[PDB]
Design a protein around this ligand. Structure first.
Ligand SMILES: [Cl-]
Ligand SMILES: [Cl-]
Ligand SMILES: [Cl-]
Ligand SMILES: [Cl-]
Lengths: 510, 511, 515, 505
C-alpha cells in the first residue's frame, strides 16, 4: 500500500547500515532514503526506528559518508545526505515511493570506454554480486548528471532493469523515497588512478586478478549475444596510424598470420568483442579502445604504440591490465622517437590538443620539448598536444620491439598456494632435527616442484639462515652450537614462486 | 537435489566476493565454501565459474583474509582457507551440503556478559542487517571452539535457527559445504578495546551512537518476551567483588533520593528479569564488572553509578563510562572510588583466577600489597589488577552520596541534526569584500535555538585561514583585505555551537 | 622310585639357577646337588641336562658362590661346591636321596637370642617366603656344625619339618643328594653388623621397616600358641650382668610412672611366657644384652629403656636402639649409662671368656681399670669390652628417671608412611618488559585417594649451563617465578611432592623452559 | 571366589618379597599387586598383613625398585609402584582379579631377532626356572607397550599360556589385581650391551656359558616341533644388506670345503625351518645382522663366518663373535671385512631409517662419503653406521677363503675346576694331597701354583710345580716368617681355589 509505506516512513524514519571503516571503502544499505528534486539533495528522516550506522556526526562531512564513484577526484566521488525529522514530512510534498531495490552510483566519464569499463562496469558488476538478490533485481540510478553518453548500451547489460539518470528523476515527482537502496561502489576491481594528487599510474595495492576480470568478460560477451590473426585497432578521426596499410603487410609478413583491422566507429561493440575475443595479438595507439584488452584470450600479446614525446612508463593503464596476475597476456610498448614521423595539429581547439590559444613563449617551449613532463590531471596542454599527434610507425623499429618479447608465433594450474606444514616437531642429540607432515591440501594435489623453506634464527640474533629442502625431515649439523635456543619457521613452496604460510614457530634447545 | 548441488560445486567451484580494503574491515560472501572436519580447515575449490575478490595471492596469509572476531587479539580473529581444484572432490569424501544461508563468526569470550554484548551480539545484530534476508533466515556458526558458555540463551535470540558450534560440526560429516555463507563481523558497533597493544580504553573513533544501541536493546527486550513508583536498582554479587555494606547503601540511597531501592543479581534472576528491572530503573548502582553492560537497557535519563575498589582508578577502566556517555544514550555517569584501605578486604589466598597472589614470589606479593594504585598494563590476566578487582568493599556512604550529587541535582529519571550546505554563496569586492548566502535547505523545516555561520578567509597561496562566527547571512570584510589579491572563502552553518555543518563549494573572490 | 632318581642324577646331573649379581646377595635353587660326608664338601655333578647359572668359572672361588650366613665373618658365611662328571657316581658310594625340598643355611651363634633372631630366624622366615611352596614344605639343614643350642625350639617354629644338623647328616650315609635344595639367606631383614671390618654398629643401608618385623612377630606369637592393667616390664638376669638393686628400681618405676611393674627372665619363664609379657608391656627396661631383641614383640607406642654398665658408651652398642627406632616400629628408645664407679662391681678373676683380665700384662690390667670408656674396637672378644659388659650394676634411680623423663613426658604406652606419586602433566610458560616463568602440575595420582596432613611441592630451578640449583617449597600446584629470572634464558625445572616434610616423592621428567 | 579375593586384598593388602641388593639385580614376588589402566601405574595397597621387603623408603625412586628389561636404557627398564591404603579400594572401581601366576617384564625391541633372543627369551627362560612352578604355569605380561611384533610366535613358546600386551589390559577393566606376580628378569644370561653409555661391546663380566645357552636351544628346537650329507649354510637377504655375488660365493665355498651349500632366509622360511637348517650346519656364513643370533642353534664344532661391509670394523660390533666364543659353545668364529670400495654399493637416497643421508647437511654427507671406517659411537641410530650397515657387498672370494682357512684347517664340522689342595704341610719344604675331586677325574695337564710371601712385604713369588712336594732354597732367609698359598691348575687355564694359608718359620 501507499498509506502503509507513508506511515512506516512518517513515524519509523530512514534506516542506514554501511559496511567499511572509512568513506573510501564504504557501501551503505538504506531503507526509506529520500531525494528532493527541488533541493537536489538526499534526505535521512529521523524517526523512532531510525538507525544511522556509522554515526560519524560531523565527520560525515570530512569529506563525505561514501564514494559514489571509484574515481578519487574529490567531487563526483562524494555521497552525502541532509537530515530532517520524519515529522517534517507533514510540511512537505507527498512522497513518490520507488518500490524496486536501487543501486545508486556515479559515472566518472561515460563517453570514454576505459573510464566506462574500469570505473563503472566492473565495479557495478561485483558491487551487485556483494549483496544477495541485487544482481538480477536492482535498477541502477546514475546521479552524476551526465546523459546516457556514447556507451549506455553497455551499462544497460548489467541489470535487466532500465537504468535512470538524474534528469529523468525530476519528472517522477518533487520528493522521491527509495524503500530499499544500496549506495556506493567497491573499488576492489580497480588497478589505475588518473593522477589527481600525484601523477597518473597504477594503484599501489591491486586486489583483482585476471580470473575475476575474465569472469566479467564472459558475462559481457554472453550479454552481447556474441558466443588465427593479428588485430589492429584503427581510428578514423584523430590519433591516426598514417601508414596503416604498410603496418598490416609488415605484421602479416613478419608473424606469418592473417591481419584484420577493427574500429569503434565502424563496428557494433558486439563485433569488436567478437574480433578481440579470438585475436592472437592486438596492436593499437595508446587510448580507450585498448581497454578491450580484457577480452583477449589467454596467451595473446598487446602491442601499444605511443606517439612522439609520450613516455610509455608515464601512461600504464593498459600495460597494468595486460600484466595482472592470471591475465596470461604479454605486453609490448613501442615509442615513436623520430620527429619526421609525427604530425602535430597546433591550430585545433584547446580540447583536441591545439596550442595557438597559449603565449608564443609556451608554444615554443612545447614544440622544443622531446618528452611530456610528468603532470597532474586534467587536460594538461602539452600532454594533449602530443597525444592527438598522428603517427607514421617505423616498421623495422616496431618489429624489433615486438620480437624482444614474442619469440616464435604469438597466441595461446590456476596457481594454488599450499597450506601450513602440519605437526612441525624439532629435537636435539650438536644436531637439530626438524620434521613435519605435508600441508593438508597437498594430499589431493599434483604439483611439479614442491620444496620446503626452513628459516633458522639463534634466539637473540636477527640473522635468519634460509634452506630450501625437498624432503619433510632434515638434520642441521653445520653452525649448530650446543646449549643454544633456535627459533625455526617452516613453509611449503609450489613451483619456486607460490610461497605458502609459515606454521607456528618452534622453540628448539641444543 | 544433492546430485544437482554436487555438480554446481564440482565444475563451478567456490565463489568469494568481499567488501573492504583490508582484513580489519572485510566481510566475505561465499558460495560453495567447504570445511574439512579432518583438517579443521576451510576450503576454496577453484572451478570454471570460481571468483576470488579480493585476490591477495600470498598477502592472504599476512596475516589473514578476514577477522572472524571483532576482538583484535592476533589469533581467534583470523579466518583463512586452503585451496584445491574442484576436480579434487573425486579423491575426497562425499560433501554434506548446508542448505540454509550461514553467518560464520568467532566469539571472543562467551562466559563474560560485556564480551558477549560488545564483541558478539551487537556486531552479529548489525552484520546480519547489512545483507538482505540474513536477519530472519541465517543460522550462526561459531568456529572459535568454546561451548555454549554461560549466555548461549542470548546468542539464540538473534537467528530463529539453532546456532551450531565447531564440536557439533564434527558429527555432521567429514566434509561440509555451505551453499551460501557470510564470514566476518562488522567492528562498526564497538566502543572499547581490551588493551592487547596499548592499555585498555575506548576506541579512538567510535562509529555507534545511543540510537543504534537502543534499537538493538528494543529487539532484545521483545525477544526476552519482557515488555509514581520509580526506583534505584543496585546490582548485587553473591560470590566475589561484594559490597560488604549492601543493606546500609540501600537505606542511604532511598533516604537521599526519596526513591524505592531494589537489588538485582545475574545469579538469582533470569536475564529477562534483569532486563525487566534495568529497563525502568531511574539509577543503576554496581561495582565495576560485566553486569554493568546491562547499562544499554536503561531508559533515557537514568544515571549509572559505577563503584571502583581500592587502588583501581576509574579512568583506566572505562567500558561502562564510554557506553553511558555515547552521544544519544542520554545517560549520566558517576564514578566512585574507594580511597580508604580500612574499607577494602583483600583475598590473597584464593586461586590465581580470583585475584590470589600466593602463587607469586614473596617479593612480588610485597610489591602488590604496598601498591596504592594498579599501574597501567596490557592484557590479560595481570596479577595486581586481579588482586584489586576481586577485593570486597565497604562503601563510604557519605562519600558516595556526595559524588552522585555532584552530577544528579534534583530527582534522577526522565535534537542532534547537522545543517545542510549554505546555498548560492556570492561575493563582491568594491578594499572591501562582501559575502552573502541563503540558509541551508533543511533549515526551512527546522527550529534550532542558536544558528551561526562560520566563514574562513584564505589569501590564495598562504596557509593562514582567518575564521569569523557571524549570526547574519551577509557580512563585509574591511581592514586586513588587500587590493589586487585573490581570496578563497569557505562558509558553513553551525547549530548550537557544536553541530558543524558541511562547507559549501569554495568561492574565488578578486579585489 | 630310587632306581628312577639315581638315573635322573647319573645321566642328567646337577642343575643350578641363582638370583643375584654377587656372592653377597645370591640365593641358589639346586636340583641333584650332593654332599660327601667323607669329604665334608658339596658336589655339582655335570650331566647332559646340567645347568650352572651363574657360570663364574674361577670367580666362583673369589671368595665363594654364596653366603650361607647373613653374618659377614669371611668363614661360616661361605658356600662352595666341588665339580665332578655325573659318570663318576659309578666309582662312589650309593647316594641317599633327600626327597623333600631343603633350605640349606648356617647359624652364626644359635646360643645367643640376638644372633638367633637377627641373623637366622627373620632371614629364614623371609627367604622361605621368596620362593612359592618353601614356607610350609621346606626342611631346614644347618651345616655350620653347632648342636641344637639354647634356642632350637624357636628354629623348629619356622618349618613344620624337624630341622637336621651336620652331626645327624654323617649317620644318614657317606653320600647325600638333595633332589631340590635352596641355599643361602637374604640379608634384606638385617639392621646390624658385629664389627668384623670397622667397629660394630648399624648397617649403612637398612632395607627392613617395623611392618616386616611385626608381621614376623605375629607369626612367631601364633606359633608359640600365645594370643586399666597396663605395666612396666623389667628384664632380669640371674647369672651375670645383674641389676644389684632390682627391688628398689621396681618400686621407683611403679611410683614414678603410676603403673604395675612385672619382672621376666629367660631362665625362669618359657619363651612363650616372655613373648606373652613383652607383647602388652608399655615400657621394657633391661641391661644391654640379647634379651632386649624381644623388643621386636613390643606393641606400637611402648618405650625401651636400655641400661649400660660403667664405661660402656651406648652410641658404640646400638643393635636394640637401631631396632626400636626403625621406621614403622613406632617405639621410643632411652639409653641410660652408669656414670658412678661406686655403683659398678667388676669380676677380673673370672675366666678370660667371661670378662676376666688376670690373663693380661699387669700394665694392661691397670690401663683397663683406669679407663672411663671402652675404646672402639673390632670383633670379637676384646678383653676391655668383656671386662665392662660383665659388670654388675647398682642403678642410680634419680638419674635413670631423669633420663626416661627426657623422652617419656606423661604416661608411657599407645600413617603407614606412604610416599607420593610423580606430579603429573607438568607444564611451564613465559611472558615476553620483565621475565616471568609459570610452572604448573596436577596432584600425584595417589593423592586423589589419600588424606595427608602437610602436602608441599619442592621445585628445583637450574639455569642451563650452571650447576646451581635453587630450591623452593610451595603449598600450591601452580607458581610464577619473577625474582632472578632472566629473559632469553633456558631453565631446567624439576618438581616433586612431599608428604609431612620427610616423605620425598619421585621427581617428574625435567621441563625445559625458555624466557 | 571373587568376594573371597576382594576381602583378602581389602584388609590384608599387597605382599612384596624381592631377591637382590640393588635395582640392577632385583626380582620381586608380589601378592595382590594391582594396576590402574586409568593411571597407567602399578599399585601397592597397605593392609594389615602387608609386607614390603625391601623397604627402600625414598630410595625406591633412585631410580626405581626393579629393572623390567635386561637392557639398561634408563627408561623402559624401570618398574615402580604408587602406594595406597587398602581401605581406599572403597572409593575406587571394582578390581578384576588375574587368577593364574604372572611374570611381568618389558621387551626392548620385539622386531629384532638379536634383541628378542638376548634381551627377552633367554632371560624369560631362566627367570621362570628361578622359582618353582612358574615355568609350566606362568602367563607373561609385556608392559613396554609394543605390539606382538615380528617374532611373537617365539615369545609364545615360553609359557603354555597366551601372553598379554598392555593394549589388551585396557579392555580387561579399569583396575587389575594380580593374586600372584613375579616382576623383573635376570640379566645373568646377557653377554652384550648396545652402547647407551660407552660404545657397544661385550659385557665386562659374562656369567653364562655355552652349556646354559645350548640347554635353552634344546628347549626351543623341541617347542618348534623340529627334532655324508653335511653342508655350509649361507644366510641370504632379499631386501637390503645383500651379497651381490651370492652364486659365485656358494660355488667357491662348495669347491673349497668339498661340501653341499644351502641358503636360508628369515623372509622365505618359517623360523622352525631356519632352526632345522642351522641345527645341523657345519658352517654358517652371514652378513653382520640379527639373523646371526641363530648361531646359538649351531651344533658343537660348527664355524661361524661373519661378513662386515665396507668401513664397518668387526671389533666394534661383536655380539655374534662374543656368543660364538663363549666357553662351552665349542664354535669357531671368523670375521671378514670388505676392504675394497669398488666392491660396495651405497644407497644414500633411501629413507633415514634404511641408512639414507640426503636428510643431512651437505657437509655431513661429504664427511660420511669420505670416511674409510665408521668411528666408535653411542646408541642409537647413528647415520654413518646406518649408511654403511645398509650397503650391498660384492665379497672378494679369495680374501674370504684365506680368512676362513686361518681357523678351519681341514674339514669344518663336528671344563671342571679343581678342589682345594688338602693337608698342606710345611717344614722351606711344602707338601699337600691332591684335591678331593681329582681322585674321580682324568685331566691331561695338572700343575700346582705356590705363592710365597715374606710376612710384612706385599711381594708374592709364584711357582708352577708338577709334583705335590717341593723344597725352596733360593732367596729363603733364616729366622723369617713366610706365608704360603697353594692352588691346583687343570690344563694351564682352570685355576682352582687356594687352601687356607700356611705360616712357616
Ligand atoms: Cl545472486
Ligand atoms: Cl531486514
Ligand atoms: Cl606362600
Ligand atoms: Cl621347574
Amino acid at each position: 500500500d501507499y498509506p502503509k509505506a507513508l506511515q512506516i516512513l512518517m513515524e519509523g524514519g530512514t534506516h542506514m547500515v554501511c559496511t567499511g571503516r572509512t568513506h573510501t571503502d564504504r557501501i551503505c544499505r538504506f531503507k526509506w532514503l529520500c531525494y528532493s528534486n527541488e533541493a537536489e539533495e538526499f534526505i535521512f528522516f529521523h524517526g523512532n526506528t531510525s538507525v544511522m550506522l556509522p554515526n560519524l556526526g560531523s565527520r560525515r562531512f570530512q569529506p563525505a559518508l561514501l564514494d559514489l564513484s571509484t574515481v578519487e577526484d574529490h567531487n563526483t566521488q562524494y555521497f552525502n545526505f541532509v537530515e530532517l525529522p520524519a515529522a517534517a514530512l507533514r510540511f512537505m510534498p507527498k512522497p513518490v515511493f520507488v518500490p524496486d531495490v536501487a543501486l545508486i552510483a556515479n559515472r566518472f566519464n561515460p563517453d570514454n570506454l576505459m573510464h566506462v569499463f574500469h570505473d563503472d562496469l566492473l565495479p557495478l558488476f561485483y558491487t551487485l554480486r556483494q549483496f544477495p538478490g541485487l544482481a538480477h533485481e536492482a535498477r541502477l540510478f546514475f546521479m552524476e548528471g551526465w546523459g546516457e553518453g556514447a556507451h549506455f548500451d553497455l551499462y544497460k547489460l548489467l541489470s535487466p532493469k532500465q537504468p535512470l539518470l538524474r534528469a529523468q528523476l525530476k519528472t517522477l515527482g518533487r520528493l522521491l523515497c527509495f524503500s530499499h537502496a544500496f549506495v556506493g561502489l567497491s573499488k576492489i576491481t580497480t588497478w589505475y588512478q588518473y593522477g589527481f594528487v600525484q601523477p597518473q599510474g597504477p594503484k599501489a595495492n591491486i586486489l583483482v586478478s585476471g580470473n575475476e576480470i575474465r569472469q566479467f568478460a564472459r558475462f559481457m560477451t554472453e550479454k552481447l549475444n556474441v558466443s588465427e590473426y593479428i588485430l589492429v585497432f584503427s581510428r578514423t578521426q584523430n590519433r591516426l596510424i598514417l601508414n596503416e596499410a604498410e603496418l598490416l603487410l609488415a605484421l602479416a609478413q613478419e608473424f606469418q598470420m592473417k591481419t584484420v583491422t577493427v574500429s569503434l566507429e565502424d563496428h557494433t561493440f558486439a563485433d569488436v568483442v567478437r574480433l578481440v575475443s579470438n585475436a592472437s595479438m592486438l596492436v593499437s595507439m595508446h587510448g580507450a579502445q585498448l581497454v578491450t584488452t580484457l577480452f583477449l584470450p589467454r596467451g595473446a600479446t598487446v602491442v601499444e604504440l605511443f606517439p612522439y614525446a609520450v613516455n610509455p612508463d608515464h601512461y600504464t593503464p593498459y600495460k597494468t591490465l595486460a600484466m595482472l596476475p592470471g591475465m596470461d597476456l604479454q605486453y609490448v610498448a613501442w615509442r615513436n622517437m623520430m620527429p619526421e614521423n609525427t604530425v602535430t595539429h597546433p591550430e585545433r581547439p584547446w580540447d583536441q590538443g591545439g596550442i595557438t590559444h597559449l603565449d608564443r613563449a609556451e608554444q615554443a617551449r612545447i614544440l622544443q620539448s622531446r618528452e611530456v613532463p610528468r603532470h597532474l590531471c586534467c587536460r594538461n596542454p602539452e600532454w594533449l598536444f602530443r597525444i592527438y599527434q598522428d603517427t607514421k610507425v617505423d616498421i623495422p623499429s616496431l618489429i624489433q620491439t615486438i620480437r624482444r618479447v614474442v619469440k616464435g608465433r604469438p597466441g595461446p594450474t590456476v596457481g594454488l598456494y599450499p597450506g601450513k606444514v602440519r605437526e612441525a616437531r624439532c629435537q636435539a642429540s650438536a644436531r637439530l632435527t626438524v620434521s613435519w607432515q605435508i600441508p593438508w591440501n597437498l594430499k589431493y594435489l599434483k604439483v611439479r616442484e614442491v620444496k620446503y623453506e626452513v628459516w633458522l634464527q639463534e634466539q637473540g640474533e636477527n640473522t635468519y639462515v634460509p634452506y630450501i629442502l625437498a624432503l619433510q625431515n632434515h638434520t642441521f649439523t653445520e653452525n649448530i652450537k650446543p646449549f643454544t635456543t633456535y627459533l625455526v619457521w617452516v613453509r611449503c613452496i609450489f613451483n619456486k614462486i607460490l610461497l605458502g604460510p609459515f606454521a607456528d614457530v618452534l622453540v628448539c634447545n641444543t
